[PDB]
Structure formats: structure tokens, C-alpha cells
């Protein structure tokens, strides 16, 4: 009874709207993934938080070389 | 006419006071020539060495402030 506007139809994202045993098979499945990516990315925050100083560091060295050029021009 | 005191005689500076074709051809030739001499006398006026040192530093100061910014960024991140 779906090929008619009078016959009722369903929405998008209604499986988790019921609250059955597929809505809790999916609410828990998402926590068993996005809890273990939360410590792949909590461990690599030691490195890249030092790398953003290393990039800044890189820039600093570059700018000091330019200064050096100007200082030699003056000389 | 001119071979007597009575007749009309021409003085000095009579091509510009007429304001014709030769009077306009003379004003645009004194300007298009002394425009290039405001180029060569201004380009060689930038060759003062004391200005280049001063400019060796303004730049240096600017760069040192950038470095200061980065150093503060690091301090924070650490």
C-alpha cells in the first residue's frame, strides 16, 4: 500500500526513531568505532603539536636568513 | 616695413605669444624631454647608501617582530 499518496510511507532515519533492537544495535556500534579512533588521534597529538612549532621554527630560520641577506647588503 | 623705425618689427619671444601650431609644438617638446630627466635624476637619487642601511634595518625590525610572534606561538603550544 505504498504506490499512492493516500497509502502511508516512511521517512529517512526512522530505524533509530523507533527504539527497537536495531536502533540500539546501531547506537552502540558507533561508540565501538569512535572510541578507538579517539586514541589514535589522542596519541598523535604529541607529535603534530610539536610540528606546528617546528613549522613555525622553520619559518623563523627562513626569516633570519633574509635578515642576514639584508645585513650583508647594508655592510 | 621693418627697414624704417615706423614699420612693425618682431621681438624676442613671439612664437609662444602667438599660440598657434609652432607655439604648441614647442611646449610639448620641452615637457616630453624634461620628463625623462625627472626619471634619470630620480632613479640615481635612490642610490644613497645611508638610506639603504636604514632600509637594511627597517626590514630587519619587521622580521624580528615576526620571529617574536612565532616564539610566542611556540611558548603557547608548549
UniProtKB/Swiss-Prot annotation, chain B:
One of its GO terms (molecular function) is angiostatin binding. Belongs to the ATPase inhibitor family. The modification N6-succinyllysine is found at residue 78. Residues 49-78 are annotated as: Antiparallel alpha-helical coiled coil region. Residues 1-27 are annotated as: N-terminal inhibitory region. Homodimer; represents the active form and is present at a pH value below 6.5. Homotetramer; represents the inactive form and is present at a pH value above 7.0. Its main location: mitochondrion. Residues 44-78 form a coiled coil. This is ATPase inhibitor, mitochondrial. The chain holds residues 26 to 103 of 108 of the full protein. Residues 1-23 are annotated as: Disordered. It is found in: Mitochondrion. Forms an alpha-helical dimer with monomers associated via an antiparallel alpha-helical coiled coil composed of residues 74-106, leaving each N-terminal inhibitory region (residues 26-52) accessible for interaction with an F1 catalytic domain. The inhibitory N-terminal region (residues 26-52) binds the alpha(ADP-bound)-beta(ADP-bound) (ATP5F1A-ATP5F1B) interface of F1-ATPase, and also contact the central gamma subunit (ATP5F1C). Endogenous F(1)F(o)-ATPase inhibitor limiting ATP depletion when the mitochondrial membrane potential falls below a threshold and the F(1)F(o)-ATP synthase starts hydrolyzing ATP to pump protons out of the mitochondrial matrix. Required to avoid the consumption of cellular ATP when the F(1)F(o)-ATP synthase enzyme acts as an ATP hydrolase. Indirectly acts as a regulator of heme synthesis in erythroid tissues: regulates heme synthesis by modulating the mitochondrial pH and redox potential, allowing FECH to efficiently catalyze the incorporation of iron into protoporphyrin IX to produce heme. It comes from the Eukaryota. The gene is ATP5IF1. GO terms for biological process: erythrocyte differentiation; heme biosynthetic process; mitochondrial depolarization; negative regulation of endothelial cell proliferation; negative regulation of hydrolase activity; negative regulation of mitochondrial ATP synthesis coupled proton transport; positive regulation of mitochondrial outer membrane permeabilization involved in apoptotic signaling pathway; positive regulation of proteolysis involved in protein catabolic process. GO terms for cellular component: cell surface; cytoplasm; mitochondrion; protein-containing complex. Keywords: Coiled coil, Mitochondrion, Transit peptide.
Amino acid at each position: 500500500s505504498s504506490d499512492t499518496p493516500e497509502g502511508v510511507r516512511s521517512g529517512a532515519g526512522a530505524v533509530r526513531d523507533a527504539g527497537g533492537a536495531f536502533g540500539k544495535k546501531e547506537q552502540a556500534d558507533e561508540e565501538r568505532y569512535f572510541r578507538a579512533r579517539a586514541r589514535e588521534q589522542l596519541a598523535a597529538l604529541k607529535k603534530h603539536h610539536e610540528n606546528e612549532i617546528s613549522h613555525h621554527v622553520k619559518e623563523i630560520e627562513r626569516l633570519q636568513k633574509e635578515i642576514e641577506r639584508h645585513k650583508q647588503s647594508i655592510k
